[PDB]
Paper text:
Crystallins are soluble proteins in eye lenses that play an important role in the maintenance of lens transparency and optical clarity. Among the crystallins, S-crystallin in the cephalopod lens has been shown to have an amino acid sequence similar to that of glutathione S-transferase (GST), which catalyzes the conjugation of glutathione (GSH) to various endogenous and xenobiotic electrophilic compounds and is a major detoxification mechanism of biological systems. Among these proteins, “short-loop” S-crystallins (SL11, S4 and Cry9) are expressed less in the lens and are more GST-like, while “long-loop” S-crystallins are dominantly expressed in the lens and are enzymatically inactive. Overall, our findings have revealed a novel structure for the cephalopod S-crystallin and provided crucial evidence that greatly aids our understanding of the evolution of S-crystallin.
After a significant number of trials, a highly active mutant, Q108F, was successfully expressed and crystallized in the presence of GSH. We determined the crystal structure of the S-crystallin Q108F mutant at 2.35 Å resolution. A monomer of S-crystallin forms an asymmetric unit within the crystal, and a dimer of the protein that is similar to GST can be generated using a crystallographic 2-fold symmetry axis. Approximately 1600 Å2 of the surface area of each monomer is buried in the interface of this dimer, comparing to 1300 Å2 for the squid GST-σ16 with 38% sequence identity to S-crystallin. The reported crystal structures of GST-σ are in complex with either 1-(S-glutathionyl)-2,4-dinitrobenzene (GSDNB) or S-(3-iodobenzyl) glutathione (GSBzI). In addition, there is a polar interaction network that consists of the glutamyl group of GSH interacting with residues Arg14, Gln64, Ser65 and Tyr97, the cysteinyl group of GSH interacting with residue Met51 and the glycinyl group of GSH interacting with residues His49 and Gly110. The two domains of S-crystallin are closer compared to those of GST-σ in complex with GSDNB; although the r.m.s distance between equivalent Cα atoms of the two structures is 1.3 Å. These differences result in a collapsed pocket that may disfavor the binding of aromatic compounds.
Residue numbers in the entry:
A (entry chain A), B (entry chain A): 2 to 116, 125 to 215
Amino acid sequence: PSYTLHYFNHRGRAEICRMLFAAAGVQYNDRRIESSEWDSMRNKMPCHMMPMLELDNRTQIPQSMAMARYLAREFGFHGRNNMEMARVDFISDCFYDILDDYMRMYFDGNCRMMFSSEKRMRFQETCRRILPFMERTLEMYSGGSQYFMGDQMTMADMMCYCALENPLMEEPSMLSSYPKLMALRNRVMNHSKMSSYLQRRCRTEF
Amino acid sequence: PSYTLHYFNHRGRAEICRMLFAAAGVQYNDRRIESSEWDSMRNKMPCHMMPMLELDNRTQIPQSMAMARYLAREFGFHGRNNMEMARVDFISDCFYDILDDYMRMYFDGNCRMMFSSEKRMRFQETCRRILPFMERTLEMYSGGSQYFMGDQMTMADMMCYCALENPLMEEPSMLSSYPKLMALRNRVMNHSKMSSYLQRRCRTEF
Ligand SMILES: *SC[C@H](NC(=O)CC[C@H](N)C(=O)O)C(=O)NCC(=O)O
Ligand SMILES: *SC[C@H](NC(=O)CC[C@H](N)C(=O)O)C(=O)NCC(=O)O
């Protein structure tokens, strides 16, 4: 099959899909659209929502987590039965929540930069609610010494990686009391296929 | 298996799961917890996030959409292959977005009532972005005369129903230019198993 990823020149909400493609060794068109060009087409497209995954130059699927789950099931980075999928999903959705609240500090619902302390406090609260739960949740398998699903890396571990990259640039110390999360992120970034993708990827501020 | 749904006395983020249980004819413990009682246990529970689905008095899975997808796959109200699942997911996630922004007008991230115009405008924008896309998306199958996945009702149609109930109480006219969405909601509410559940369910303001 053929894949096209539509998004801005950001890591942002599409980065989970890029990591999935990189991990699976699957080539795709990585379409990075300038904001004003996207903005001028908005009222002319049946599907305007960003990011969006296009399959076989045909089917358009927006909603970043829906896109990621599809790539995960396709490439074998999701759960293998219903229970396992539920676990991969709640972990991933928890990290999406963090990323979503982070993005809401800077961007409106129409993708415009909003460049106040209230949004930052929502974000910081969202971290305090979620991260200790994720540290514990990770510990459920293999004492938390490996991945969220034991020895198989899945989209949950990738979400843990990409969702926290910006928060870590803003506050490099914020994961200091979640040592298992840090070793997992370090494990993901050194994983086969993932190391070279991450080291050769363009440097963007989001 | 055995099911327990934990949430407040609200329709809110858990209502998708209740509809799923009702549609599948599956009995569960519908646990409606008073807020202050939930609040007093918060720092004593490994999993404090609301809503939460408990399986066999054992596994705790929060994240309302993760919970719903699990019940949907279990009961047969999800897609039957990867592509179909991606379509059910983006539709459901679009409606979650609407519901999420609606809930953010009234509740903080710690479940407290925040009872300003800014949050309402985010919400209203989110409706304008999403609803026309959903009207069109529905039209992809069977001219939009049936359900999002043709003749099978899935969690996507249920989301379309429960996500808009409160917005419709606040503005009963807001779906007037999406006639296919309205006929779908009316189709869901008269569906077998769903009609009696909806007519006998407790009246709550959220
Ligand atoms: S760029 C801002 C808007 N995107 C989203 O909010 C997508 C949210 C999904 N939950 C996701 O992909 O995670 C956006 O695309 N606004 C423009 C529009 O036409 O919808
Ligand atoms: S009640 C407010 C918080 N709930 C959520 O935000 C859950 C969001 C998920 N995305 C979902 O289920 O849809 C909450 O539970 N805060 C308390 C806590 O301990 O996390």
